[model samples]
Target: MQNQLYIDGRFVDAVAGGTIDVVSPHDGSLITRIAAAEAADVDLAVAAAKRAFPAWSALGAAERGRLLLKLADRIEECSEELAQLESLNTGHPIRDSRGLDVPRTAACFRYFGGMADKIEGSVIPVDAGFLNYVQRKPIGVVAQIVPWNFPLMFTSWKMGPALAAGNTIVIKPSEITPLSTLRIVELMTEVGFPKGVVNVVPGYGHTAGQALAEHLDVGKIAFTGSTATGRRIVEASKSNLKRIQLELGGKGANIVFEDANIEAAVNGAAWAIFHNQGQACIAGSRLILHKDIADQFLERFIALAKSIRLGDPMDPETEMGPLTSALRRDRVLSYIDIAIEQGGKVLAGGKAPDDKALANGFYVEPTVVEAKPQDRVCQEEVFGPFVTVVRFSSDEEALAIANNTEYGLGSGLWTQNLARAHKMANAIHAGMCWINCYKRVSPGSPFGGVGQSGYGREMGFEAIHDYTEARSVWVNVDAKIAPHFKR
Candidate 1:
């Protein structure tokens, strides 16, 4: 439990001596009291990043790659401890933290480590006597505000490319789940990153997060959170006119066609909404099923949703854990009521589980609702263990339903017909689409969305491009210059 803020390679308390209680969502127990950073603290962190930017950016790309690679190795060395801390802090089931989150964090870093030296400039042939080329240069002092849903993994996602591109960072981890991120900073120091290169300020969004976003010294700000906050960030960033990359809210649509494999779709849908208590922005929150297979799909889906084991996140056998916070749990519960008010019927769960052992936890039973495409529950991002079911009689209607919302993040369609898969995939308005599978991601694949889901991307070469700027250079190869006046 490193409870202090990591600034300039040292862990220190907040300037105002303020602290926030880190509570376990599992049983509402206080895990620790960590420093609560405000505007003044953010200033210090950003200044430190600015101070280190010169040397950090000047470091060779291969050398930077070596450091990231070392950090990746160190992460793997402490995988178990990091996984447990993440599970305790975020209420993610230990199995997922261990099997998915921790490994993915390491893999992201490793991928970017390998990608560092591979960032090459391009040469373009323009005129016979001239040479032109494009050079990618790092942006200085990047500020990343990570969301609480997947703090540990997102930390790697934001930091990996920025650092690999030779940018110094001032990152604000969500105050609700900052433990694993702090631990990662500790690991970075141990792995021999230069002082002041990476600073972690865990604090409230209004004070610390807003300060970083509005700071004049920062060259760019990358944020992962709600779409409303993303809008605020955009407004705040207008002061600096800094580069902004936002991975915001999502209401992912999972579609199942009449010719789809019912068993596979049901299982995939369960994993999409039930995993991580459906905290993921990319969770398949909207289920669009063809009318021919709607009843059969719901039978198996409802049973699966009801059978999900809700218990302590630390329990290995637990299939689903509590929501990350009491507020979030209540918000999810309220949406169920809203669904009912909007003429939607609850097919499985519409309230919290009545288990005595889990009473103190911020738990919600996995909910499945029958709702119209235009219903509130389906239109807005519930961001919980809740899924809205909408049926369509034809492929055109299904595509219409999937693309109805303002969101265009992650989407999926289940069908054995290859041509239909391609057609539906093209028709759906989303950043990433899956066929048969759902919520699949790779470091090599670009991630982000259009429309209200926010702009820019994370991971892969796209991330590298986002963190850097291109400078086109032109030179006269031959010393033969033509006089403007024909002198």
Candidate 2:
């Protein structure tokens, strides 16, 4: 394998021949190696970015937009290859990779490309003889750290707006998986992104990620990961007071009411919790069911959960893939044990598959537990193919149980009553509220969460703000200059 770093429009290796392994979760096979970046490598990547910033920034907006449009066109053309690589490396179902993830990524790039020419500098109403206005400028040398769950999709999300804003970037794809991102870098360079405009150094977090966060020359560090690590990234950036943006942890709630359409609730709730094998940070793991309908809902919900097709993700028939890794699989399985110990009833699937051959891969049987409001399973994020349900008698009780945890990232409400839906959507402390829907994202929409789910938005105009800095420019329109000196 030609495992190396992409820097200065060239394929290069980290200094001292450092390397990291890429493994297959499907069979735990060693797939290949990627360049394991060190501090020296980080210096090189940052230098490349710093050297290239001025020319790219000075280009006219139309030219920049044209280049970005070219990149989007290239992505769309290579959509099939990118989808295959995403599935091969990450084990995502091909249907999802082709149908949802790849198209969404293309849309994101196109959205930012078209938005390039439209990004405006605003004129302000100022006092007296002074003229003041604000223009958005790219913060120089952006460092992005994206998680492995949806590596290629997030690469587009991170790279699109930053480069469109004329900032150079050094991105670190998660060490666990980097092939798809590596392949995308090839397409980016092929599409005529100038050297150093965008780069990816595939390596470990403490080394590659830590160096970027601590680099003095870098102006901004944008990250998507856990809250604990986000705090660490902030602490590291404080050495030189670098601007930091984080999108972190989530503990989302899916609330169901008795008055809601029973069938829609069953299918939608199934999609809410089971899609992505419940690996999503925003997965609605806490099932808040109305007490009157609890028994009936659980029965239908278990049937739906059990019906999930688990097999090779690349297979068109496979609905869910294996869990990301064994470590994550074990962590989710441990939560099931903890739930059982806490007196929660196992409604449907709880134990691992009984077949001996299936044990080699990272697989967790779709698990559903009847849990108390105060149970640990109900409070913390298990981050797996498991969901725990808590019954509530009143709307207030449902809201209370839903809000029990500190996380407020994404929440879903199912009801036909417009008044109640609006009231609940307004009241829920989350960045995104899905009324009778789940996980529908687009390039024109803003995606993010508040509180423990992290800060900063990731799409649309709101998302572009994080990648740029606002500066006020003032000029005096008066004919006389320095009147006191002249007199």
Candidate 3:
């Protein structure tokens, strides 16, 4: 385990020499202690990025792309190590780490590697004598605040586009799970990225994160976390009026229509909320079911929820693992109590597992609750292995319930009727909608949300646009000076 602040491409201690303990979520043991960076450390990283910006950004796009591709290949070469580190740090099951997280991280890097040279600008038609065209230039220095839930994948998500666009970055991964990110930075160095091009400072949000957000030298700040912190970042970014991209909280609604395939919907709903212990921002935490099929859906959904194997994340057969921390586990359990207090009916697992072997870890059983649409459990984002079911009689009611929350990140609907599917997809107030799937993401597809769920996109062409600014150039071909400019 490489545990240290990565500054200017070197592994070093914090300026203050403070450290943060990294505990394993699987067994509540100390895995390692990483350097705890503060505002002073953030300053060092930002200065390094700024110093490297001129030369790094001036490099040819194809050359930069080649480095990224090399990094992708390196990640694939060390897939087992990366997967094990990710699973051990983030409490993701071994299968998920290997099958989804690590592969997705590599794929994201590969996609952006190929995309580096394809950032094209356009020519605008204006006056006959003047030539007008737009050029996309990289924002000088970027600050990225990655959340703890999916640290490895998110690191690539933030770095891929920023680096591909020729921007230098100072990324602050969550202090809780900074191992995988640190390892990736090591790989980046091995792949021949220049010193100071990419820096990692693992620190608390109040210190390093806030410093990065408020730094005048930073050109943009990309954050992925809770809504409250997103608001705080917006407030902090006013110091420089820097560009901000946020992928915050979500209370995604997964609606199953009466005409939908029951078996698919059941399995899909389980995958939505139960996978990753329902830690994803786009997890289908709210399940809106057609009244006619609600009964049948609940029976199977509850069974699957109970059948998910909960054990050490390193165990390949463990379908679900512990929450990343005891604090998160307690918070999720508290939500279960709140659900019962609000007269919600628990249909399945609602507490920690009974296994004594897993007692020391932060584990919460998969929980399902039947609650009213207006219930707090339904409205709030309880980001855990918890799902709230609400019955709706018609399509209109289902849409109403789905859009009722303050969040508009992701929503899903299941239906065999093509017309109804199209109409519902159009009406949903979310950035992305799924016809018969949930939480499906691609590097090519734009990923983000609207309203309180935060703004700007994370992937695809939009991400490149987010990392760069368009400058319009005008040239005089045949025309002379304008009349207004005549002396």
Candidate 4:
């Protein structure tokens, strides 16, 4: 296991020589103990990133593009190994880690690689004698904090654009899931990336994360995780008044109409809630169904939820894996109790499987519950293979239930009526909406949320703005223009 922190293009020990235990959720066994960075270590990383900014930004855009393309190639070459490592560390199913996560990670880098030279400036038509243009320039030394749930993919999301835009970075992958990111650092070094251009510090949020956010030399901060943590980052960044971009918490609403196709809706709903064991911020936790189809839908949905395969993450046949941590599993379990206390019925799984072989791991069976929209189970983010059902009679009611949450991240509806789809899509308060699908993402599409879900876009051309600044340049071409005005 690669346990040391990456700083100035080298793996080194923490200043205080501290280590954190990496426990595997698959078997509740010790994986390894990696370095635990603190404030002092973050300082070193910030300084190194700041120092490397000038040369990196000074490189021609096309040359920078070439380096990014090389990195993308490196990621693709090691895709299988990375997928295995990611699955082992995050308790994600090997099939998904290999197929979705790894490829998407590479695609993000490749997409941003092409974007390096594509950034353009606008020449504004000013009055005669002066020419004005706006050029987007990199904001030096960005500090990015990755969440544990999707470390490998998220690493690329933050780094791809920042690096492509010619900014150096200091990244902190979650301590619980830092191995894949550390491996990525090794790949970058092998490809001859400049020293001090990228630094990785693995540590707890309070120490290392706080230091990086508050560091004076860091020009900006980008974070993905909980809303509460995002608030902390916002507070810490006040010292430098650093530019901040956050993709935080989300409680996605998934609505189904009476006119929708039952088979397609059932399958799509399953993937929406059970994919990644339903740990995504955009997990369709709130299931608002039309009253006409509620009973019929629940019968099929319950059967499917019970039949979902949960076993070892390394097994290709297993559709669901254990949660990333024991604490997270327990938290999901607690919500089941909350749902029951709030007068909701547990129609399906509310506990772990009885399989003796998997008893030691952090596992929760695919759960379905019948609950009112006002219930805590529907309101809160369980972040597990948990889905709550709510019934609505009409279009207005469905929309009202969907918009009840404080989050406005992701939402989806199933309907054959094109006009109704358009109407509901516009009415719902969300960043992205799905008509017949759910959880669909692309590198070229804008991905993010509003309100408590947090601000800023993650993918596509809009992402470059988070890493760069618009600077206006003007020149006086007219020889007759006077230096000073005379009375």
Clashing pairs counted in every model: 0, 0, 0, 0
Give each model a TM-score: 0.98, 0.95, 0.99, 0.97
Scanning candidate 4 in windows of ten residues, the lowest lDDT window is 478-487
Report the lDDT tens digits of candidate 4 across residue range 72-168: 8998899888988889898999898988888888888888888989877789998788889999999999999998888898878999899889999
Residue 297, model 2, lDDT: 87
Q: Which stretches of candidate 4 lie over 4 Å from their true place?
A: 479-486
Question: How far off is residue 397 in model 2, in Å?
Answer: 1.4
Task: Give lDDT tens digits, candidate 1, residues 1-487.
Answer: 8989999999999999889999899899999988999899989999999899999989999988999999999999999899999999999999999998999999999999888998888999787888899999998999999999998999889999999999999999988999999999999999988988999999999989999999999989999999999999999999989999988888999999999999999999999898999999899999999999999999999999999999999998899999999999999999999999999999988988898888888999999999999899999999899999999988899899999999988999999998989998999889999999999988879999888898889989999999999989999877576688896
Ranking by TM-score: 3, 1, 4, 2
Kindly list the per-residue Cα lDDT of model 2 for residues 1-487, writing each as its tens digit.
3468888887788886799877666666677888898778888888898887888887766667777788778888988888877876676777878886788788888888887777778889876677889999888899999988788788878888888788888988888778877877788789877888777787788998999999998998989887888989999999789888787866778888888877888888887777777877778888888887888888888988888877666786778777777787888888999999999988867866665755666777788999897999888888778889988887788788778887878888788889878888888888887888876677768888788777888888877888888999997885435667676
Residue 183 in candidate 2 has what lDDT? 77
How many clashing pairs does model 1 include? 0
Query: For residues 415-454, could you state the per-residue lDDT of candidate 3 as single tens digits?
Result: 9999989899899999999888889999889899899998
- Candidate 3 lDDT trough over 10 residues, lowest sum: 478-487
Question: Judged by lDDT against the true structure, how good is candidate 2?
Answer: 0.81
